[PDB]
Design a protein around this ligand. Structure first.
Ligand SMILES: CCCCCCCCCCCCCCCCCC(=O)OC[C@H](COP(=O)(O)O)OC(=O)CCCCCCCCCCCCCCCCC
Ligand SMILES: COCC(CCO[C@H]1CC[C@@]2(C)C(=CC[C@H]3[C@@H]4C[C@@H]5O[C@]6(CC[C@@H](C)CO6)[C@@H](C)[C@@H]5[C@@]4(C)CC[C@@H]32)C1)COC
Ligand SMILES: COCC(CCO[C@H]1CC[C@@]2(C)C(=CC[C@H]3[C@@H]4C[C@@H]5O[C@]6(CC[C@@H](C)CO6)[C@@H](C)[C@@H]5[C@@]4(C)CC[C@@H]32)C1)COC
Lengths: 614, 129, 40
C-alpha cells in the first residue's frame, strides 16, 4: 500500500510467496487504500455506477470488473463478473495466477513501477502487456475527456507507449528465437482474458508496430492462403480452379472434401468476387454504350439484380455488428468513406432506375443518371487494387497528396478568375446581364493553361471592326498570367510533392500492413457466393435461423500450453539478460564507473600517504 | 559499351516498372471519362467496334496538349442540345486536373526519390558485365 | 534552470574524461613519490 517496490522485492526474496499471500480480502484491502499517489479510479467507478454511489462508498471486486469491462471494449467480459465468481463471492479464497490480478491493480491505480515489476513475474507476459496498453489508452482517453489536470492524460499515454514497446520487443525476441512457437504464441486461446488472442488484443489497441511485424505478416499470409500449400504461383491457379472445377483436384492441401476446403479459402472468395465485379462492370458499360429501349433488356436486368443484391447484402451486414442498439450500429457502420459512397451511389442508381421506367424525358434523365453513376463504379476498382502489395500504398499516397493539391487550387482559381474577369470586361463593353457572362470567366482561362493557347482569340485583330479602347492590355495580362500559372505555382507544387514523399510513403506502408487484417477477416466472414447470385445464400440463413477452428483462433491442449508457457518464460529471461549485458558494456557506463573508481582510489591513496610511519 | 551510356539504359529499364505501376491508374481514369462522355453525347448508337475505339482515342490524345473545347462539348440553327450535355466540360476539367497535375507530379517524385540506389546498382552491374 | 544546466554539464563524457585524466596524472605522480622512499 506504500508503493515500496524494493521492500516487496526483498520480502519476495526472503520466503514470501504470492500464491499463498494474496486472497480476496487482501486484494479488496489493496483496492481501498489511500497511502499512495492520486489516481482516477473513483471517478471511473462513479461514472460506471451512473453517479449514484453513496458518499465514502467501499469498492468491491464486481465494481472493478465492471470498470474493466467498460474500459476494454464492447465484447470483453471480465472474470470478476462471471457467475462462478459471483457465487463464490456471495457465499463468503485463492488465485491460480496472482500476478495477473496484481498487475491489473497496479495498472488501474497508476503505479507504473509496480506494474513493471509485476509484468515479468508469471505467465502470459505478452497478453498482459497488450491488456495494460489498452487499459492505459482507455484511461487516458477518459481522463482527457473530463477536464483533468491535463498531465494525467500524458502520463497514461506514456505508460501505454512503454507497454506497447515492451510487447513489440518481446514479440521480436520470440520470433528471432523460434518462428513456429512464436506463431503458435500469437493464436492460442486465452482462457483468462475473455477467450481472446494476442492478435485480437493488438488490433483492439490499434498497435500498428505489432501488426506490421514480420511474424504477424507471415501469420496473416498463412491465414489468407487457407488450407492450400501453394506459394510459388498463386492467382493463376486459383482462377483456373474457379473456372475449371475439375482442375481443383491437382493441388497440394494441408494436413470429395477438397471442394469444401478449396472454396472456403479467403483468396478463392476474393477472386470470385473480383470476377463477378468485372463482369458486372462490363455489362454496365454495354448497357450504357448502346441504344436504350422502352423496357430493360437482359443485361440491364442482370445489373439491376447485382446492385439490388449488393444493397441487401450491405443492409444485412449492418444487423450483425458488435454494438447492441440499432441506431448505434448504423453510426458504427457509417465510419468508412467507402460505405457512405456506396450508399449514396446505390440511392442515386435507384432514383435513376425509377425515373427511367417512364415517358421519354424521364427516361432520358434516367439514362443521364446512369451515365453519371458509372463513373463511381469505374473508380471503385482502386479498392480491389488495394490488395496488391505495390498498388495500395500508391493509392494512399494519392489520397494524402490531394490535400496539398487543393491548397494550391485556390490560388490558381484566384489568378484565373482575375484574368478572366479583366479580359471579358475589356473585350465586351456592350453586354446585358445574363448567366452566359458567368461562364466566359472560367472556361477559356482554364482551358488555356493545358496547352490550348490561341492568340487569334485572346486578342482578335483590330475592313476589320474598330479596335476596342485599350485592347492591347489583353496580350500583356495573358503573358503575365501564363508566366505565373505555368512556371511558378506548378514548380512550387512539384517541390512540395518532392520534399514530403518519404514520410508519406512510410506511413502508407505501415497503414497498409495494419489494414491487411481487416481485409482478411472480412473475406473470411463473407459467404461463398458472389453478389450477383447471393440470393441463394440470403434465403438459406433464414431457414437455418428458425432451424472458428482456424482463421480466428487456435484451440490447444494442456501439455502444449505448458510448453508454450515455458518457451515464453525463456524468451523473456533471454530478453532481460540481453538488455542488461548490452547496458553494462556501453562506453558511457564504463566511463562513469572508471571515474568513480578513480576518485575513490585517489582519495584512498591520499589517505594512505597521509600516514607517516618513518 | 560507352562508359556513360550503359548505366543510363539500365536506369531506364529499372524505371519502366514504376512507370507501368501508374499506367494502370491513368488508364482507369481515362476509361471512366471516355465512357461517360461517349455515353452522354451519343444516345442513338448501334453495337459496333467503333464504340470501343472512341473510348480511348480522344481522352488519350487530350492529355498530351491536344485539347479542343470545340469537340469535347460541341455548341448546342444548331441541332438541339442533348440532355445533360453540360456535364462533359466539368468532368473534362476534373479529368485534366487529376491526370496532368496529381499523377504526373507523383511519378516525378517517385523517380526523384529512387535515383541514388538505382544509379549505384547500374554502375556496379555494368562494371561486372 | 541553473541547477539543471550544472547537472547536465557535470555528467558529460568530456568533463568526466578530463577529470579522470587529471586525477590519474596526480595519482601517478603521488605514487611515484611514494615509491621514491626506501624505508627498507
Ligand atoms: C460520393 C459518390 C457519389 C457517386 C455518384 C457518382 C458521382 C460522379 C463523380 C464520381 C465521384 C467518385 C469519387 C468517389 C471516390 C472516393 C471514395 C472514398 O472516399 O474513399 C476514401 C478512401 C478510404 O478511406 P477509409 O478506407 O475509410 O480509411 O481513401 C482513399 O484512399 C481514396 C484515394 C483515391 C481517391 C482519389 C482518386 C479519385 C480520382 C477521381 C477523379 C474524377 C475523374 C472523373 C473523370
Ligand atoms: C437572359 O436573361 C437572364 C435574366 C437573369 C440575369 O440575371 C443576372 C443577375 C446578375 C448575375 C447573377 C448575372 C450574371 C453575372 C453574374 C456574376 C458573375 C459574378 O461571379 C461572381 C463570380 C465569382 C465571385 C468571386 C464574384 O462574382 C458573381 C458575385 C457574380 C456574379 C454571380 C453576380 C451575379 C451576376 C445574371 C432573366 O432573369 C429575369
Ligand atoms: C457493324 O456491326 C458489327 C456487329 C458486331 C458488333 O458486336 C458488338 C458486341 C458488343 C461489343 C463487343 C461491341 C461494341 C462495344 C463493345 C464494349 C466495349 C467494352 O469495353 C470494354 C472496355 C474495357 C472494359 C473494362 C469494359 O468493357 C467491353 C467488356 C466492352 C466491350 C468490349 C463489350 C463488348 C461490346 C460490338 C456485326 O456482328 C454480327
Amino acid at each position: 500500500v506504500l508503493d515500496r517496490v524494493d521492500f516487496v522485492k526483498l520480502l519476495i526474496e526472503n520466503g514470501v510467496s504470492m500464491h499463498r499471500f494474496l486472497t480476496i480480502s487482501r486484494l479488496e484491502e489493496l483496492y481501498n487504500t489511500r497511502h499512495g499517489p492520486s489516481n482516477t479510479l473513483y471517478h471511473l467507478v462513479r461514472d460506471v455506477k451512473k453517479g449514484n454511489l453513496p458518499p465514502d462508498y467501499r469498492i468491491s471486486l464486481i465494481d472493478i470488473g465492471l470498470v474493466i469491462e467498460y474500459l476494454m471494449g464492447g465484447a470483453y467480459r471480465c472474470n470478476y463478473t462471471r457467475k462462478r465468481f459471483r457465487t463464490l463471492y456471495h457465499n463468503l479464497n485463492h488465485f491460480p495466477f496472482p500476478f495477473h490480478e496484481l498487475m491489473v491493480w497496479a495498472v488501474l491505480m497508476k503505479r507504473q513501477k509496480m506494474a513493471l515489476f509485476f509484468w515479468q513475474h508469471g505467465e502470459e507476459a505478452m497478453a498482459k502487456a497488450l491488456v495494460a496498453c489498452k487499459l492505459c489508452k482507455a484511461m487516458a482517453h477518459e481522463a482527457s475527456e473530463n477536464d483533468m489536470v491535463d498531465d494525467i492524460s500524458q502520463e497514461l499515454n506514456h505508460n501505454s507507449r512503454d507497454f506497447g514497446q515492451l510487447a513489440v520487443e518481446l514479440l521480436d525476441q520470440s520470433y528471432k528465437q523460434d518462428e513456429q512457437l512464436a506463431m503458435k504464441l500469437l493464436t492460442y486461446e486465452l482462457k483468462n482474458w475473455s477467450n481472446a488472442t494476442c492478435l485480437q488484443l493488438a488490433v483492439a489497441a490499434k498497435h500498428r508496430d505489432f501488426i506490421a511485424h514480420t511474424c504477424s505478416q507471415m501469420l496473416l499470409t498463412d491465414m489468407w492462403m487457407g488450407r492450400l500449400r501453394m506459394r510459388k504461383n498463386s492467382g493463376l491457379k486459383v482462377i483456373l480452379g474457379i473456372l475449371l472445377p475439375p482442375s481443383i483436384l491437382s493441388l497440394e492441401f494441408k494436413n470429395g472434401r477438397k471442394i469444401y476446403e478449396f472454396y472456403n479459402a479467403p483468396i478463392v472468395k476474393f477472386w470470385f468476387y473480383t470476377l463477378a465485379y468485372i463482369g458486372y462492370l462490363m455489362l454496365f458499360n454495354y448497357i450504357v454504350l448502346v441504344k436504350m429501349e422502352r423496357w430493360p433488356s437482359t443485361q440491364e436486368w442482370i445489373v439491376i439484380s447485382y446492385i439490388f443484391t449488393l444493397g441487401i447484402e450491405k443492409m444485412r451486414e449492418i444487423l450483425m455488428s458488435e454494438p447492441g442498439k440499432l441506431l448505434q450500429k448504423v453510426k458504427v457502420w457509417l465510419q468508412e468513406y467507402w460505405n457512405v459512397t456506396d450508399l449514396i451511389a446505390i440511392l442515386l442508381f435507384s432514383v435513376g432506375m425509377i425515373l427511367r421506367l417512364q415517358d421519354q424525358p424521364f427516361r432520358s434523365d434516367g439514362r443521364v443518371i446512369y451515365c453519371v453513376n458509372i463513373i463511381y463504379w469505374y473508380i471503385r476498382l482502386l479498392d480491389i487494387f488495394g490488395v496488391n502489395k505495390y498498388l495500395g500504398p500508391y493509392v494512399m499516397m494519392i489520397g494524402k497528396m490531394m490535400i496539398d493539391m487543393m491548397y494550391f487550387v485556390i490560388i490558381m482559381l484566384v489568378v484565373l478568375m482575375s484574368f478572366g474577369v479583366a479580359r471579358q470586361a475589356i473585350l465586351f463593353p456592350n453586354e446585358e446581364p445574363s448567366w452566359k457572362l458567368a461562364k466566359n470567366i472560367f472556361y477559356m482561362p482554364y482551358w488555356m493553361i493545358y496547352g490550348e493557347v490561341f492568340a487569334d482569340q485572346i486578342d482578335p485583330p483590330c475592313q476589320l471592326p474598330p479596335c476596342k479602347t485599350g485592347a492591347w492590355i489583353v496580350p500583356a495580362i495573358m503573358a503575365c498570367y501564363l508566366l505565373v500559372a505555368n512556371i511558378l505555382l506548378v514548380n512550387l507544387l512539384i517541390a512540395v510533392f518532392n520534399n514530403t514523399f518519404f514520410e508519406v510513403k512510410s506511413i502508407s506502408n505501415q497503414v497498409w500492413k495494419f489494414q491487411r487484417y481487416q481485409l482478411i477477416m472480412t473475406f473470411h466472414e463473407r459467404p461463398v457466393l458472389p453478389p450477383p447470385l447471393i440470393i441463394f445464400s440470403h434465403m438459406t440463413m433464414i431457414f437455418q435461423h428458425v432451424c472458428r477452428d482456424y482463421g480466428l483462433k487456435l484451440f490447444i491442449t494442456d501439455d502444449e500450453l505448458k510448453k508454450v508457457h515455458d518457451f515464453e518464460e525463456q524468451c523473456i529471461e533471454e530478453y532481460f539478460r540481453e538488455k542488461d549485458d548490452r547496458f553494462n558494456s556501453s562506453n558511457d557506463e564504463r566511463i562513469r564507473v572508471t571515474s568513480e573508481r578513480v576518485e575513490n582510489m585517489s582519495m584512498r591513496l591520499e589517505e594512505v600517504n597521509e600516514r607517516e610511519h618513518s
